[model samples]
Target chain A: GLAGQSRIDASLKASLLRAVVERQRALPLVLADDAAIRGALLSPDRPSLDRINRKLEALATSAEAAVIYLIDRSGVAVAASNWQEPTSFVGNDYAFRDYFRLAVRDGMAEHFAMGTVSKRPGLYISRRVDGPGGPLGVIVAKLEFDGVEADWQASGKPAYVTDRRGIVLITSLPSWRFMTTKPIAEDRLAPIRESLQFGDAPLLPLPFRKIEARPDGSSTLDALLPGDSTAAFLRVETMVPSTNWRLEQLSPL
Target chain B: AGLAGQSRIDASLKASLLRAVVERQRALPLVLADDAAIRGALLSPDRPSLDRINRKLEALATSAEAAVIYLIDRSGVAVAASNWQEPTSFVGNDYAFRDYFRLAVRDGMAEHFAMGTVSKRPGLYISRRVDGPGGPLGVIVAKLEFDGVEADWQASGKPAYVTDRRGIVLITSLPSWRFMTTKPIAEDRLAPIRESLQFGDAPLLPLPFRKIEARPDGSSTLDALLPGDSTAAFLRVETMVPSTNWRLEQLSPL
Candidate 1:
């Protein structure tokens, strides 16, 4: 575009998100392995449940997580960090959550969605608590990346991270979130929209027309931005480690 | 992106940072404002009731990393404080001289950054008015410590500072930069501020950086007068700190 390139840590920022994800990925595993969590699922007394809720509150502070909660084998929220809060997750049914089902089937699941309860978005890192008798329940930690997007914005460059569906999960420009990087097939879009995983977004493409593509994996485009000026930009992208996700940039030219 | 400035802000970024820190800090004060014990204490209560609330306040100050949390009666005298057990506790101290108290009383809420008259620490005081059946009953105050935020900025190897409406530096990575000026001020304006003990005895000198030129594209070139009489050129950019009458000043080595 016009004549230039990008430089605000597109690759480094991509790697940063992947590394952060791995850090949170390992946390739920340790929590799931605790007998305090597993035992609570197996005929927990009233006093035992109090211990678990207090334990979750402590973990929420220590883990820097938005919420830490424990669920039953039948998908009932039994303990949570927000026990004292008005929107406490205790006694709530979470059987419909994507993370619950995936964690039940595969022992672990990293799902991102709007918290059907809190109405906020975060990565739900869920782990199935394997017990002496059978699978006890699920333990989850909700990770919010407001810090990550804030850092991206500080660079004065537009950046975004897309999930496997090419749907933007996080972005420096928050308005671009929930938008698709490319057009989704009608059949694929139907189920995703119905799932309501991303809330009630229109599932449209990001607001820019691709002018041309270079062989070296760069692109040129004139995008209407920052209040109606169609300025030129060069797009640079990097793959997030061990995932189909991509981190892309729209560096002003 | 207009000629007014090269900045098209993504301020939800910095706004989110401060808001998070503030919400966590304000949470205790907000809850304390609505507390049954606090309101009960306000309505002419016993010393034992006040003491119980003081311990609760102290517990919150410890967990929230706030410098202090105190409650003041309609007479502007500190009734209960988080540090009630300490020798220099805020109990019985009068805050009528502070604008955060007066402004909060006038507007129901207010924020002010100043050097503490008692603790001698610098912080942004969050004040809220408590209402009774008639008019106003009391005020709840919470002061936030920005050492962690400043340390984070210092680690980035770039110079950064925040300035108030009077162009006096409020938050800065450099410890000596506090209460300094980002621009020149007339004595008429500067004298009134210096007369007040709000900033203490600190000299409000101009920052060492001297401006050289401003570019049409909105960046400015300046020369930082360093220690030992050395100087270096820098590219300066400024952004508005969302929700405040302040600006964020940043520097990049040229």
Candidate 2:
């Protein structure tokens, strides 16, 4: 019944957002208090970079962060958790990244995008590190949701998270990731593609056969599953505060 | 740094659990209010609908997955119950002194958490007024057990519990912690509640919690030695349930 789907969506939204908000609220404290991060950003030298890299390595494991990096005011990575790895983020410039640009201007920012170097998708949480002169640099932490998505998928239900622009950022169905919830206009889609925010991936709308509005202000979708079989689903949504994103769950009806 | 992450997780988990429980509890009374048979039984008390009401209540309790479902008249006498066939049947029992019944009769709806004297199980009681041609007929009471919720929390390997404003735990993942208080209770106030047998004669003692730190955001980190040799640092997160003064807390090791 539709009621069952609604109930499932309510529970799923609560479970997913709990983890998302927790990480979002906790990552800033690490960046705000790290002396090495502030020092490395103020002076982007070999010694400062080494110290910041070591600090990042230690904090990454302790914070359970996928990666922690510091970017100078010039938007170039000075220190990173994977400094020794072949695909280290050090030396990579992210001036075009929204998280970097927004953090520099707004003091803090959060963005979910595909990693250019790591080839992984994660939520990039960034906070500006202030210095005596002005803004020293930005501290960025990548939070991957593969584990959370896997747990949601194990419930045998389809769920996804969408940004204000209707772009799907996270989903239980791997193939549906990076897809749009609705068709996007050329003008609106241009800047996203030009910035390579989601990489070169195709940003197409999901193949929903039919959409119907329910009486309770909720909607239902008839969509083709992975195997090309069509099924009816009840859509439930909850807002993720501060991010202007929504967590939606599509439960089979 | 790890401690910070653990604290964040604990806070988030507690908030989510509180929201889920409050949402679930809020919807239950509406389900009872919509039941026609429950209304019919309460309205026509003189009729021989006891058999029919009992059968319907049993089906509802099973489908709703509640601990028990019963109807009590204005006089607070249960006429039909879901557990009528069981030895601990609530039928014919007087619940006039219980707050769930008293408040439901006075305010049209009421909710309470206490130890069930008949079944001896700890649960939350959700009661709704049944309206009929004669203004108000009776109250429909649903006892909800947290066995499934507790199992879910236990699976996460974190200790969690819900407590009333008085700091008495009503539902807990740790079964032994049920009815335990988070703080010391005044002797005068405890006497009346204990005498009424609302929670039985169990000594309501405070949990062995040593406060380490408390945050302004309603989260705390505490140290608990318990009865074990190894001491552990726990991150305690509290979230208030809307419309109720109760709080749900989750404790996770740092």
Candidate 3:
């Protein structure tokens, strides 16, 4: 008898995640806006989102993660690809949570905790997305760090968040290490950062090589030297009812 | 005859030839860009090149081969010209010396005859004064080659001629042997070359021409001169000007 196997959502999500990681070489750890965000939002078709949901659900359940929600504004959840095995966890009060609260105050928040909901240690990264109305909510990536940390090689990776500010928000990493790890901050970037705002200006990706959308529906790919790095990233924050403000973040690795 | 008479004739002929060439130089048609159009062109969201306006004038000149097109600055210098023949010699020429320049300065249009080489072609002058952004800046002159006038007549495919208020032949299809047979001067000539017919003030009617019948509105008159040996033909058109007393002419054949 022939071996029987079916295409699962996790498989697709895994593929997309892998592609995103591979493409991330030229993409800094930043939030996208305008064309860049549009590309990310539409990276996959409806079927692709479904696949991502399955993969995210698998990661949550296996890692005993509490919630896997994508936020639009600052505090609200637009989509949650979670198991929700426990009813109490669904629609639970996230307003007072440290990560959630900080995101509401600032534009982004992240934390690592052990045994918050499940008895396992976890890591969470929450971001504010600019949705149709005001800020939609927060997209929380809750992961069992202990479970998935081993799979990812930490190396000298620098984590960051790109918001409306030109400077990428640094969390766990120090500002001095921005160069060796990211290399984008090595040059004087105060002028470049000062030039960027959330309005009509373009949010160019660091390290280049990736194509992003433009306001005129055109695509632009930045040119960067091979092996070059970027300390900054791009993100979308809500400033108006149905508009997005672009924010670039610096590395804090 | 003495050299004095010959000199006078030469001078008169030079003056007349100059007048013809000048008229030809002024003959080209000019349509002003409306206020809205000018504003749109000046304040375009994107920076536009100078060629935009030049292209429009070029398109206007393409069909009117009998005329030349030029743009004058407020200082009375020719800034742009469509025909290569006119040359840049007009660039710094004083507008005060030219009748059209004077009319433009006075916020009016003046027509007269004079001789000068434009594009190395001997021709009759037909000119107009135009108002630009900064007020009366320059004039547009079209040169109608004497031979080209013959061509225009042939091209008309009808009994057509060009003339001034004094029915003088500026360009005629008829042979040169019959030049200046009649002198045209009549108060009725005032009607066709009225301010309403042309754009500005009128001057004393000159030689080698005859006046035509006057009209009430004085917007236009018939060019009584024949273009060809056509028994049943006549050419008619109207002109508009800012003043009642304006100068104009026609050239007819036969």
Candidate 4:
């Protein structure tokens, strides 16, 4: 229902969306784990934060529109860009929101939304920001879907993100309204979900690992999204504390 | 991808240029020394006589000897000398000095001599400017020690003889044994060697070849090889010492 109707046939769009979700379902659990993100989210030293933030800002400057924000574990906003416009959002608690709730419960989270008040379509990447005690907060990289579509399309494959409950969050291409439930009901994702839990086979080309740990200092399973080309060459460089979120860079074979 | 490829090419080119420069500096000494030997023979007395005496010195000294002559200014002021004789005493002598001495003081060019020694014996002269006190002052003469060359040959090792531009042997491994002792080359022949001779903190002349060994602590010693014998190696190790530049003492096989 989140995806709008498209000029392409419904079945064709639905099939593409389904494939993308399947990829998301197959995402390596380490990539979507909250604990892993927190582990990797090295807290910038106070003196270095300004310089570090400036560097991050420079990287984002090329984007058509970007929103960079850091939040505490309780969902309190710590820092954000001046263009974020709304000052009242500072320190606001986003804990009960669907995104934060899902990330905390599962270790990583994602969501897709169009602007109701904002000017751009929003695609958010969120992970639990671990501090000295436990989960400190979350760091969200919000991208304008339209602005990032080119990069996604250039990926030469469809992509998608799903929450722990097996909910489809975003699709590289808009998905059709109907037949969305079929992917969930047909148990098409059962094996992928199993793999995500066990951190076993069915890997994506992403470089990431899950945050949650098993009794043996391991982690829960997660899905992988493989590129149509060069899936084997994909590298997953993962560490702890970052749930299962991954920062991926890849070349098409 | 383009930028990465360019960077790799640039790095490779830089490394290649650095290696070539280092190797070229190492090989220069050998070529320069050969040139000095050729000019030595041309300026000395008739080749036949010089050769005969050279053979005699070699036989008597049981060593290899090279013949060299000395020259004076037009005023008969000794300006340049060969490696074989004592040049210090000849400097103040008037009749010994000649046009060669004046030219050496002025031009500082490589010049050859074919004449009899002051005692009317055959010899050759090779002269160049030697470093002086305060600034470049005068020329030196080297009356090359014939027996010393034989001694160097019998030692079965390369021997180094450093001198001023005037072919004067300033520092020789065998000081007392050279031409300074036996059949002397000539009075003027030894004059330049004494006039240009100096010690302590002189600006180092550019060397032909220098081999350096580095330490992990960021210090190094440079060893240079002179012409003639392959076994001969001269190390200007003094360059490694802090602040001051000094001549390297010869390290010989006992």
TM-score of each: 0.57, 0.52, 0.27, 0.24
Superposition TM-score, candidate 2 onto the true structure: 0.52
Q: Which segments of model 3 are wrong by more than 4 Å?
A: A1-253, B1-30, B33-56, B63-66, B84-95, B110-116, B119-135, B142-149, B152-163, B175-181, B184-254
Model 2, B88-174: lDDT tens digits are 889999988888888887898888777788677777788988776757778888887767567656555567787877788777777
Of 1 and 4, the candidate ranking higher by DockQ: 1
Q: List runs of model 1 lying over 4 Å from the truth.
A: A1-253, B1-16, B195-197, B227-229
Best by DockQ: 1
Tens digits of lDDT, candidate 4, B45-96: 3546335333322222221122333333334444333332344334335633
Error of 3 at B246 (Å): 12
Candidate 3 residue-wise lDDT, A1-253, digit = tens: 0000001111211222222222111111122112222222435356644543464464344324455654433233333555344432334556656667676567566554433445333445565544345444555655432211221112122223233333332222332212221234434355343332112222333443454554522334443223445332222121211112121221111
Candidate 3, residues B28-147, lDDT tens digits: the string is 322232222223333341224224444444544543344455555556655545543344434345555555556545645554543343343334344555544565434555545556
Specify the poorest-scoring 10-residue window by lDDT in model 1 chain B. B3-12
Comparison by lDDT, 1 against 2, better one: 1
Q: Candidate 3 at A39: error in angstroms?
A: 35
Model 2 chain B: weakest 10-residue lDDT segment is: B19-28
lDDT of 4 at A115: 32
Clashing pairs in 1: none
DockQ of candidate 2 relative to the true structure: 0.01
TM-score of chain B of each: 0.88, 0.85, 0.43, 0.24
Local accuracy of candidate 1 as per-residue lDDT tens digits, B49-148: 7987687678657645678889999999999998899998999899887888999899988888877876777888989888888878899999887785
Candidate 1 lDDT, tens digit per residue, A1-253? 2222252246546655754565455446546655466667887899989988997897687556899899898899999999999999999998878788889899888777777756677888898888776778999989888877877877667799888778888898887888888778877776776454654776878778766788857778878764668877788887876466888888786
